């Protein structure tokens, strides 16, 4: 199976350079070129520039000759990209794709946010959203995970490792009145087995090398003071 | 450079209906014998997934419904029934000459029948008022269109600040929205009061729905 793995999300100082990471696995590296294309959220993608594996040879784009540079490790199957002088123009998604013959891109990375900023990393705290089968609707209970007060973007969330997807809502952050960032993931789930099923949810923050799993129980209090 | 234009910018099409896209490109893009066009499917939070190669090619393991057509300037995409997991940015992108450049996207929305929200709140844990600050989340879940409000109410009385809300894209699999709301408090605040409730209008129902629990 062809796969590129791209490097986590970073934040970077105004001036600063940072340097991207693209691992190839599943093919021969240097039999395909290799592009770099920048999005920023909801626009068109951007073409940057190419390297070619096989022996360091480079294309770039006119509008960014000036801002990458594109180099690759043979014996890691890696492809790299150095951004300098970092400008908020510069904030965006950048992914790496492989093409054959420079036509098409066949295979994409799941790309890296670039957040230029002088603000600090921080990694969130995570919450349990409890169910319970007294607050059910339609016979249904919710759970969830709010994972609050981190920045930059993104967060990930995933239940159960990856196995628990259906009925999963992870909702697009907030920014919070502190310049932070929020946000839940929540699930539907039968009401009839939460004592017999587990839901943990596996939070991600890569500025901050957060990991975080959360076990989501059902709450057990008569006694008031 | 070769400048490609998407239009629409939003298609709207019902369950199963036929979608047709179009780009444009700025000069020709196609030889006497191929057209150098390829288009891309967008999912949420996903790359860009290839789908037709060379105008018409349909990429290996890439669904029947999808098709593509034209040479010179003038590019289609068409999905014969639309599928909730058809949801996504459709871009063109060509290989003519250099650099390769994109079309700047079409949107696919779907115009599934109507669905009230499952509505839940959940108060905040007990590790977080540790910390100090009270988040309270009030869920709708599932419903469809997008139209919906939301008022917290503290002691019966709407709250005029203190929230936040955020929704879902279409679903992937049902093509419905979610919406979280979630009202923040320093503790000291939250434990002055003794009821909380969320109560949610949208057009799938006929009265507000409350939801609310006791501190």
């Known amino acids: 199976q062809v796969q590129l793995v791209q490097s986590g999300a970073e934040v970077v100082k105004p001036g600063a350079s940072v340097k991207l990471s693209c691992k190839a696995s599943?093919?021969?590296?240097?039999?395909?070129?290799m592009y770099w294309v920048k999005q920023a959220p909801g626009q068109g993608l951007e073409w940057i520039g190419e390297?070619?594996?096989?022996?360091?040879?480079?294309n770039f784009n006119e509008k960014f000759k000036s801002k990458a540079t594109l180099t690759v490790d043979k014996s890691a199957s890696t492809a790299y990209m150095e951004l300098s002088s970092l400008r908020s123009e510069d904030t965006a998604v950048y992914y790496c794709?492989?093409?054959?013959?420079?036509?098409?891109?066949?295979?994409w990375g799941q790309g890296t946010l670039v957040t230029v900023s002088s603000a600090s990393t921080k990694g969130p705290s995570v919450f349990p959203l409890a169910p319970s089968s007294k607050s059910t609707s339609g016979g249904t209970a919710a759970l969830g995970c709010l994972v609050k007060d981190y920045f930059p973007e993104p967060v990930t969330v995933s239940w159960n490792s990856g196995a628990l997807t259906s009925g999963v809502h992870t909702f697009p952050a907030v920014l919070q009145s502190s310049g932070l960032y929020s946000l839940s993931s929540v699930v539907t789930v039968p009401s009839s087995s939460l004592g017999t099923q587990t839901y943990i949810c596996n939070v991600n923050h890569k500025p901050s090398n957060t990991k975080v799993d959360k076990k989501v129980e059902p709450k057990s209090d008569k006694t008031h003071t | 450079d070769i400048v490609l234009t998407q239009s629409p910018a939003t298609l709207s099409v019902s369950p199963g209906e036929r979608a047709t896209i179009s780009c444009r490109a700025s000069?020709?893009?196609?030889?006497?014998?191929?057209?150098?066009m390829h288009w891309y499917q967008q999912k949420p939070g996903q790359p860009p997934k290839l789908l037709i190669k060379?105008?018409?090619n349909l990429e290996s393991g890439v669904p029947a419904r999808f098709s593509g057509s034209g040479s010179g300037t003038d590019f289609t995409l068409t999905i014969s029934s639309v599928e909730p997991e058809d949801f996504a940015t459709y871009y063109c992108?060509?290989?003519?000459?250099?650099?390769?450049?994109f079309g700047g996207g079409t949107k696919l929305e779907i115009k599934r029948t109507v669905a009230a929200p499952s509505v839940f709140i959940f108060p905040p844990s007990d590790e977080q008022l540790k910390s100090g600050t009270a988040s309270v989340v009030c869920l709708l879940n599932n419903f469809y269109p997008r139209e919906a409000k939301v008022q917290w109410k503290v002691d019966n009385a709407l709250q005029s600040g203190n929230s936040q809300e955020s929704v879902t894209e279409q679903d992937s699999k049902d093509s419905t929205y979610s919406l979280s709301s979630t009202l923040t408090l320093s503790k000291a605040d939250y434990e002055k009061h003794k009821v909380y409730a969320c109560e949610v209008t949208h057009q799938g129902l006929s009265s507000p729905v409350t939801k609310s629990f006791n501190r």
């Open positions: 599943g093919y021969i590296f240097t039999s395909y070129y």
């Open positions: 060379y105008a018409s």
């Open positions: 390297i070619n594996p096989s022996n360091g040879d480079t």
């Open positions: 000069q020709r893009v196609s030889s006497s014998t191929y057209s150098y």
């Open positions: 794709t492989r093409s054959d013959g420079r036509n098409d891109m066949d295979s």
């Open positions: 992108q060509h290989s003519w000459e250099x650099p390769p450049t």
